Design goal:
The structure is a monomer. The protein is an alpha+beta fold. The chain folds into two domains: 93 residues, 2-Layer Sandwich (Phosphorylase Kinase, domain 1); 196 residues, Transferase(Phosphotransferase) domain 1 (Transferase(Phosphotransferase), domain 1), CATH 1.10.510. The protein is built from eleven helices and ten strands. Strands 1-2-3-5-4 form a five-stranded antiparallel β-sheet. Helix 6 packs antiparallel against helix 8. The radius of gyration is 19 Å and the shape is globular. It starts with 11 loop residues before the first helix and ends with a helix. Bound molecules: the ligand O=C1Nc2ccc3ncsc3c2/C1=C/c1cnc[nH]1 and chloride ion. The site of the ligand O=C1Nc2ccc3ncsc3c2/C1=C/c1cnc[nH]1 has 17 residues, from strand 1, strand 5 and strand 6. This is Serine/threonine-protein kinase 24 36 kDa subunit. It comes from Homo sapiens. It is classed as transferase/transferase inhibitor.
Length: 289
C-alpha cells in the first residue's frame, strides 16, 4: 500500500499541467505543475518505477512519512498517481526557492540567518515530537513560499522512531551535512538532525558547508576523526556559539530543537518571516540580471 495513491483510472497528465523542472528528490525529478481543477501551483515528482528496484520501498517510506506530517513547516503531500510506468507524486509548491538558491546573489545577514534557522527549528521540533528524523537537513532542502514562509522538504531519507526501535543506524544523508554517528553507523536519533542543522547554519553564514572543497569520500573519515567544525570569520559570538552547540561530537551534548528555539542567537536576531520576501525579491532581481 502507498498512502494517498489515487484511483488508477485518474490520468495525472489530464489533471495536472506539467511545467518546468525545479529540482530533484532521491530518484525522481521535481516539476512545477498546475492543478487543472483549482489552478493552484503544485510540485510534481515523477519516478519511473520500471527503472527502479530497491527504490520502491524507499519511495513508500518517504510518502508514508510525508503523509503523516501535518505542519506549517513541512511540505504538504496531496496524493500520488500512476501513469503507465511512472509515479506522479503531488506535493506543495513553494515559489520563493530554497535557502541555498537565495544565497546566490550574495551573503545573508544575521537577521536572515536567525529567522531561517528559527523556522527550520520549528520544523525539526515538530518532526522530532512525532518521533520522526529528517536526516537530510541542508539549505537546498529548506524552501520558502513567495510570502517568506519557511518549510522543510525532501523526505527521501526521513526515518521513523518507534517504541521497539528507539534509534536508527542506517547510513543516509548528504555527506558534508551528516553527523559523525550516522557516518560511523552508530545508534542515532533526532540529535543527528541537530548536527546537520549546525552544518546548515555554517552553510547559511558562509555559503557552503565545511569540507565543501573535498571529495565527499574524504569526509567519511574526516568527520568522525576531526574536531567538529566551527564557524570562522567575522560573525557574532551568539551565532558562533549556536553553531558550536549543534556541532558537538557527543549527541547527548547537543541541545534539542525546542531548546534551540530559545537560544540567544535566535531570540536576539530573528524577525518576522514576512521580511524574508526581501531575500526572495533580491534573488528575482538578480536572476533577471
Ligand atoms: O516547490 C517545491 N516543492 C517541493 C517538494 C519536494 C521537493 N523535493 C526536492 S525539490 C522539492 C520541491 C520544490 C522545489 C522548488 C524550487 N524552487 C521553487 N520550488
Ligand atoms: Cl508560494
Amino acid at each position: 500500500g502507498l498512502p494517498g495513491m489515487q484511483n488508477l483510472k485518474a490520468d495525472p497528465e489530464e489533471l495536472f499541467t506539467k511545467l518546468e523542472k525545479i529540482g530533484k528528490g532521491s530518484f525522481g525529478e521535481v516539476f512545477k505543475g498546475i492543478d487543472n481543477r483549482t489552478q493552484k501551483v503544485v510540485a510534481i515528482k515523477i519516478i519511473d518505477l520500471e527503472e527502479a528496484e530497491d527504490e520502491i520501498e524507499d519511495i513508500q517510506q518517504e510518502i508514508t512519512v510525508l503523509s503523516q506530517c501535518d505542519s506549517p513547516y513541512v511540505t504538504k503531500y496531496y496524493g500520488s498517481y500512476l501513469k503507465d510506468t511512472k509515479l506522479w507524486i503531488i506535493m506543495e509548491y513553494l515559489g520563493g526557492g530554497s535557502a541555498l538558491d537565495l544565497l546566490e546573489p550574495g551573503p545573508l545577514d544575521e537577521t536572515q540567518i536567525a529567522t531561517i534557522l528559527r523556522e527550520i527549528l520549528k520544523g525539526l521540533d515538530y518532526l522530532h515530537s512525532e518521533k520522526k528524523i529528517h536526516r537530510d537537513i541542508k539549505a537546498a532542502n529548506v524552501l520558502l513560499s513567495e510570502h517568506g514562509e519557511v518549510k522543510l522538504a525532501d523526505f527521501g531519507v526521513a526515518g521513523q522512531l518507534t517504541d521497539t526501535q528507539i534509534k536508527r543506524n542506517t547510513f543516509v544523508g548528504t555527506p558534508f551535512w551528516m553527523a559523525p554517528e550516522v557516518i560511523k553507523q552508530s545508534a542515532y536519533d533526532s540529535k543527528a538532525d541537530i548536527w546537520s542543522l549546525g552544518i546548515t547554519a555554517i552553510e547559511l553564514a558562509r555559503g557552503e558547508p565545511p569540507h565543501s572543497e573535498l571529495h565527499p569520500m574524504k569526509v567519511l573519515f574526516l568527520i568522525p576523526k576531526n574536531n567538529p567544525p566551527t564557524l570562522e570569520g567575522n560573525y557574532s559570538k551568539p551565532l558562533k556559539e549556536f553553531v558550536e552547540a549543534c556541532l558537538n561530537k557527543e549527541p547527548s551534548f547537543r541541545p534539542t530543537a525546542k531548546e534551540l528555539l530559545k537560544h540567544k542567537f535566535i531570540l536576539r536576531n530573528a524577525k518576522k518571516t514576512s521580511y524574508l520576501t526581501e531575500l526572495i525579491d533580491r534573488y528575482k532581481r538578480w536572476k533577471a540580471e
